[PDB]
Ligand binder design. Structure first.
Ligand code: HEM
Length: 129
């Protein structure tokens, strides 16, 4: 697809994740198993997205100044970038299971683990200022 659509797709994917992280953070603060499962259901849908095809070479912030925050570095570290995405999917599965187990403590713990995967990747691959 055109750069405009992959950029569109990956932007929507990440916005959805951000909204999910935000909502689950609030649930973790005041655990309600029903709201957790609702959030987990949404996170599950989000994680079904194949994002590898969302980062084709030529879509870094240097190629498309201001259109994206993806750093050119991603393309010099695709194995690490994929690994970090993988870590997120795994952390996500744990958050989903904890929500479904109705386990508030595990949910909060898994959520910390998930947040960490977002940071681990952003630190090396997303544009700050
Ligand atoms: C962890 C679950 C996670 C969250 C939360 C998250 C959020 C997020 C947002 C809100 C954006 C900005 C979206 C927008 O344009 O409004 C964003 C952008 C990027 N992310 Fe991220 N992200 C999470 C996880 C990860 C992981 C696991 C990776 C790397 C393996 C990653 C990468 C990126 C990149 C690159 C961007 C820039 C996208 C762009 O501007 O085109 N994120 N993320």
């Amino acid at each position: 697809a055109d750069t405009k659509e992959v950029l569109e797709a990956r932007e929507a994917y990440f916005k959805s994740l951000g909204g999910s992280m935000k909502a689950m953070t609030g649930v973790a603060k005041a655990f309600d198993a029903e709201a957790a499962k609702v959030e987990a259901a949404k996170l599950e849908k989000i994680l079904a997205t194949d994002v590898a095809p969302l980062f084709p070479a030529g879509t870094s912030s240097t190629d498309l100044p201001g259109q994206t925050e993806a750093k050119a570095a991603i393309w010099a570290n695709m194995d690490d970038f994929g690994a970090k995405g993988k870590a997120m999917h795994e952390a996500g599965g744990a958050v989903i299971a904890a929500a479904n187990a109705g386990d508030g403590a595990a949910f909060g713990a898994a959520l910390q683990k998930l947040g960490g995967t977002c940071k681990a990747c952003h630190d090396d691959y997303r544009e700050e200022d």
